[PDB]
Amino acid sequence: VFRRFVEVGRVAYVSFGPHAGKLVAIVDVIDQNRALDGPCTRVRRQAMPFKCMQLTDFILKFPHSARQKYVRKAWEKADINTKWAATRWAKKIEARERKAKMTDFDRYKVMKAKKMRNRIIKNEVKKLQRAALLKAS
Amino acid sequence: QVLVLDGRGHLLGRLAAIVAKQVLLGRKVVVVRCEGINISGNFYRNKLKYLAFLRKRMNTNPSRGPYHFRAPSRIFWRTVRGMLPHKTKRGQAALDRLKVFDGIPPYDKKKRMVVPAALKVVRLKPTRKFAYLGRLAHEVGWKYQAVTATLEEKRKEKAKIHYRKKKQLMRLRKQAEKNVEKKISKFTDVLKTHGLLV
Amino acid sequence: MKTILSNQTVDIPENVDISLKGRTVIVKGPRGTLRRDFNHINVELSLLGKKKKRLRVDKWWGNRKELATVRTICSHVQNMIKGVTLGFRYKMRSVY
Amino acid sequence: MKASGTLREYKVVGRCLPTPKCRTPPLYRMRIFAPNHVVAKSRFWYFVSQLKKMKKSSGEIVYCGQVFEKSPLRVKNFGIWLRYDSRSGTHNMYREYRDLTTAGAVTQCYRDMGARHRARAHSIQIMKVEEIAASKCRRPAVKQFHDSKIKFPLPHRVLRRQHKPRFTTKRPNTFF
Amino acid sequence: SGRLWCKAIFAGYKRGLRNQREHTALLKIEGVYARDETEFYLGKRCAYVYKAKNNTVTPGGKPNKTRVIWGKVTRAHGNSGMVRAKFRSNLPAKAIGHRIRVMLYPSRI
Amino acid sequence: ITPGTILIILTGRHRGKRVVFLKQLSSGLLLVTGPLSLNRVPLRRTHQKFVIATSTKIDISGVKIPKHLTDAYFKKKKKYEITEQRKVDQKAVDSQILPKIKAVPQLQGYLRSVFALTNGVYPHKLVF
RNA sequence: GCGCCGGAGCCUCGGUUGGCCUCGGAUAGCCGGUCCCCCGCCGGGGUCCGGUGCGGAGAGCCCUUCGUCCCGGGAAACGGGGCGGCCGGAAAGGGGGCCGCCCUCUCGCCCGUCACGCACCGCACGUUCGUGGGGAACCUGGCGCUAAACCAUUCGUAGACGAC
RNA sequence: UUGGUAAGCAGAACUGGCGCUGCGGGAUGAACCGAACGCCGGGUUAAGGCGCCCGAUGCCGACGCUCAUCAGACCCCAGAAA
RNA sequence: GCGGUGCGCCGCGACCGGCUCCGGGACGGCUGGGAAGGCCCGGCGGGGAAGGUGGCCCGGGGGCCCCGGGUGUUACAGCCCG
């Protein structure tokens, strides 16, 4: 039932650490709990454990003996950023960031809009309630 | 101020330390549903721990000293009394603030919280064995296993019908948004830019 | 150390049809139906291939003590399949 | 021995004072892995006092500097000949490691030997460290990393930072 | 109209193994568990609000039964959430685990 | 502290209200004044400690200020009586405030609203 | 002379500043809809479709009070306030649902136009559940009621005295 | 180091201590460690800990070891062999 | 009006000095007169392997695409030493 396998050359999202909020590819597996690149945000090659990573289901065939040049070429050829934008999780990460950095005046306007939306609920859902009561009785 | 805390698959000491920390700061705690508490170790040691507790008795008069309580709520009250300084007045106030019962009888229709720190899959390994507390209570003398289990099924059948009626209200919630989508489309776009639907 | 993978494939016949749901399988055939739970060992089952021809079992990252319990469950499954297909006839005599 | 943090390399050379009898003492070089140059030179005087007739009062230290690795990206399979002291008697071992840097391999060696056999490094010497080809490796836990076509999941995903939320309603599934 | 004060709880006093110090008070605000997160309330005033039997006068109003004890938040305590404070008069042992007000009008914004 | 921002009044008998800031006086006190219809705020002086600011900066470039008002004018003499000069000055300031706050949509509701906390709101977590 | 339901007043006391009213269990596997196909007096059994760092996200939902005049736009008139029946209701009984009506207007809420309020002029206990709990009398509508225990008198099946 | 086969036994060479000295830790404690004392306010530490009993590891700590059908929790100090 | 002493009660604000704790930024030397890092398979230019890469063969899962095992040193990719 495992869908996402740890495979050599798989794009993974870093959850936390120094490169917080960046994508990385599994270049080499040297130690049991230590992995071993992101050319888009200029991630320098270093070691990283398996705790602060969130893997995705995207791979491509390339040798691991190549340096940063062919990794950057494969990244720009595969164009991972458009698939990351099409991913539904990254479209709501920015929604959570906007909800965090929401202006209080904008929050007041959204609050009044949700008050009007709740009055629309109080009319329309009550009309569905009386319609369901007419269907039942 | 009232927190209802579930006790399914929760450890003794790990949950008890968190409850003893939160009660002394001041918060009404209702510990509910203590029947699936498991302790690490095999069935020999988890039985001989209680057997050593039975052997630690009073020789002159056993009707004055320790009492070997059979109820799991009273066992939890015993270990909370052992952890807390119950001689102090703040401990006596924590006894009034704390509320412990077995099963779930009068406010059964409430949502309850789960402490993840005392969880079995979090703390213990899945290869470890365990022993049940209600089975040991029924073997030592607690007679209300068949009384509680038949009353537990009565609230599960009521929650089966009510959640199905709660599911029926959820179809009416999404279908009402489809009918009135002409006028709320301006109200939809102002929430999608702020990021509430997505 | 923890061995990463030790697979053991089972070539079940066509007459033995199974349908797993979690760690609970059902076995049918010419005669007899037997069921057994497999929640305690916490392993991974995989019924692969078109028309369900073979079964696969996994034990990811287990040591020498935990990998020893994997092969015996395959023997119990083969004994269950033998009991469904052929059966068990035990003959025995009395001594006085 | 205080294994404070990672290890550092020090190319230490030293000799004795110029005598009126002989022109110069024979110079020697030692690559000491130590936390700092003070204990690097201390272990240098330790091994020199064990091997040759030389004392720290009648002697001198020529150079003690750090040189870095010329290939940090390339993987190297090291093999360390362990000389240690047991609680009853003295014995020797040999153990391989897989790490990029020599300092990282030596740093992992102290924690690994202290976990296995309770290595008190005050009287433990390292006589030889050398890189090994992939075919000449002995340990199966080292040789199992040599697999180009490998494809496997993770068995369990344990989560941390549970005291900061402190409350939850649904049960979180650890299957990821 | 509404609530104009956050929920702070008096936790205890600065104490060792056996001795205790009543002059330094320990406070804990609900919803913060970090030293970097409690940096916003450096200099906000605290007030233990209680009531009594006698009717004490109110500045700008009729006399009432309630009384206050003002204080000052100096700096934090511990790793995962605690803050230190010092009042004008020392609190008794009756005021253990009770609700206070956190006056935020000495602002730094 | 910039001219034109929205402030939360604290120390007055009107508290929790959202008042538009005008300018810095020569004495040192923050002269802050809301609409006479919306916020009901007169020409009142506050202090930089007692003022909590809110990041909403409207344009205040095209305004003017009279010179007859000073620090000695807004002094507590003794029975409070509203003079005829204060009403004319408040109307003259409100006539300059009026077109900008009418051009900004849904601003009069935020001005007439009052600040109040609820469950799960702590200002050190979220941002205004 | 005592009590069940609806005034002018008076002592004493403690925490408070909105509720979260709910299936189940898996954790090396689940959540939600159609369920075309069967068993079942209307629920499960599979089949399918989206999600899986969970949006059918408790890091989440709803209430939101500065007030009042007038003209408008969607909004809505089937709705809001209350009286009379019908059910649900006990592990430690809820002040819950629906329908007719004696009664009322298109006002509540979301945006535009205008006017007003002791605007108390720089320093604080404001903001609440409050027909809150306990004790005493003073008042007035509807409605019922005129009790028992102890000391002692006879008892030994009781028994130092009580006590039975 | 002597006398005893060994003791909380006796008798001797060097330093420090109770007696003449309390505080902090070691649960309670003549000798253990650190450090020695006028009365207060601020900042900061040794010895020591940071699941609760009381202030802190509630670090998004690492390496590996151990399942016991009588584990483990500290120098004095309160239990062990082949 | 100038100078000086003091308040019947409760509090707040401001500037100046001293003692502490913390945060945001900017500049410069050394190394092997730093190892290494990205840009023009950098061209010419000789050789070698395996965690065997294109391709070849063997066997089975899908109606023409993938798996495991050998052949191989560049080949429709890397790669270390001059």
DSSP secondary structure, A1-57, as one string:
---S-EETTEEEE--SSTTTT-EEE---EEETTEE---TTTTPPP--B-SSS-EEEE
Q: Please give the residue of chain C at the shortest CA–CA distance from B128.
A: C40
Residue F102 CA: distances (Å) to CA of A79, A111, B103, C24, D23? 48, 21, 61, 70, 99
Exposed (0-12), middle (13-18) or buried (19+): which is D51, by Cβ within 10 Å? exposed
Taking the C-alpha atoms of residue E26 and residue E100, their distance in angstroms, rounded to an integer, is 12
Min Cα–Cα distance to chain B from E97, Å:
6
SS3 A113: helix
The sign of the torsion formed by the CA atoms of D137, D139, D145, D147 equals: positive
Q: Cβ atoms within 10 A of the Cβ of A122, count?
A: 9
Question: Within 13 A of B164's CA, how many CA atoms are on the CB side?
Answer: 6
- Helix ranges (DSSP H) in C1-96: 71-85
Q: Cβ atoms within 10 A of the Cβ of E86, count?
A: 13
- List the structure tokens of C24: 């609970």
From residues 82-101 of A, which are strand H contacts by CB within 7 A? none
User: Which nucleotide is closest, CA of F86 to its C1'?
Assistant: G119
Identify each DSSP E strand in E1-109 by its residue range.
Answer: 8-15, 20-29, 45-58, 61-76, 83-87, 99-103
Taking alpha carbons only, the member of F36, F27, F69, E5 closest to residue F14 is F36
All residues at 6 or more sequence positions from A32 whose CB lies less than 8 Å from its CB, including other chains: none
User: Which nucleotide is closest, CA of B110 to its C1'?
Assistant: G22
Taking the C-alpha atoms of residue B135 and residue B144, their distance in angstroms, rounded to an integer, is 11
Taking the C-alpha atoms of residue B82 and residue B91, their distance in angstroms, rounded to an integer, is 11
All residues at 6 or more sequence positions from F54 whose CB lies less than 8 Å from its CB, including other chains: A104, F5, F6, F7, F8, F18, F128
Taking alpha carbons only, the member of E46, E55, E29, E57 closest to residue E87 is E46
Taking the C-alpha atoms of residue D68 and residue D102, their distance in angstroms, rounded to an integer, is 10
Q: Does A7 touch chain B (CB under 8 A)?
A: no
- List the structure tokens of A39: 């050319």
E and B in touch (3+ CB pairs within 8 angstroms) = yes
Question: Within 13 A of A25's CA, how many CA atoms are on the CB side?
Answer: 27
DSSP secondary structure, C64-88, as one string:
TTTGGGTHHHHHHHHHHHHHHHT--
CA B9-B15-B17 angle, to 5 degrees, is: 165
Taking the C-alpha atoms of residue E78 and residue E86, their distance in angstroms, rounded to an integer, is 17
Taking the C-alpha atoms of residue F65 and residue F31, their distance in angstroms, rounded to an integer, is 12
Residues in chain B within 8 Å Cβ distance of D158: 122
CA C42-C44-C48 angle, to 5 degrees, is: 160
Residues in chain C within 8 Å Cβ distance of B126: 42
Residues A129/A130/A132/A134 CA torsion (nearest 10 deg): 170
Taking the C-alpha atoms of residue B5 and residue D120, their distance in angstroms, rounded to an integer, is 48
**From the CA of D123, how many Å to the C1' of H8?**
39
CB B43 within 8 A of CB B135: no
Taking the C-alpha atoms of residue B162 and residue B154, their distance in angstroms, rounded to an integer, is 13
- List the structure tokens of A6: 């740890």
Q: What is the 3-state secondary structure (H, E, C) of B127-138?
A: CCCEECHHHHHH
Q: Cβ atoms within 10 A of the Cβ of A16, count?
A: 12
Residues B127/B129/B132/B133 CA torsion (nearest 10 deg): -110
D154/A6 CB distance under 8 A:
yes
Q: CA gyration radius for chain E?
A: 15
C95 alpha-carbon distance from chain centroid: 37
Within 7 Å: CB of C5 and strand G? Answer: no
For an interface test with D, the pick among E33, E35, E38 (most D C-beta atoms closer than 10 Å) comes out as E33
Taking the C-alpha atoms of residue F14 and residue F5, their distance in angstroms, rounded to an integer, is 18
| Method by which this entry was solved | cryo-EM
A7/D150 CB distance under 8 A:
yes
SS3 C12: coil
Q: Please give the residue of chain D at the shortest CA–CA distance from C59.
A: D155
Angle between helices B133-140 and B145-179 (to 10 degrees): 150
SS3 B150: helix
Taking the C-alpha atoms of residue C12 and residue C31, their distance in angstroms, rounded to an integer, is 16
Taking alpha carbons only, the member of B4, B3, B53, B44 closest to residue B26 is B3
Within 7 Å: CB of D152 and strand G? Answer: no
DSSP secondary structure, F73-119, as one string:
TS---------HHHHHHHHHHHHHHHHHHHHSTT-HHHHH-B--B-T
Regarding beta strands B2-8 and B28-36, do their DSSP bridges make them parallel or antiparallel, or are they unpaired? parallel
Taking the C-alpha atoms of residue D159 and residue A54, their distance in angstroms, rounded to an integer, is 12
Taking the C-alpha atoms of residue F42 and residue C66, their distance in angstroms, rounded to an integer, is 80
Taking the C-alpha atoms of residue B163 and residue B167, their distance in angstroms, rounded to an integer, is 6
Residues in chain A within 8 Å Cβ distance of F128: 103-104
Residue D46 has φ and ψ, to the nearest 5°, of -65, -50
Identify each DSSP E strand in chain B by its residue range.
Answer: 2-8, 28-36, 39-40, 98-100, 130-131
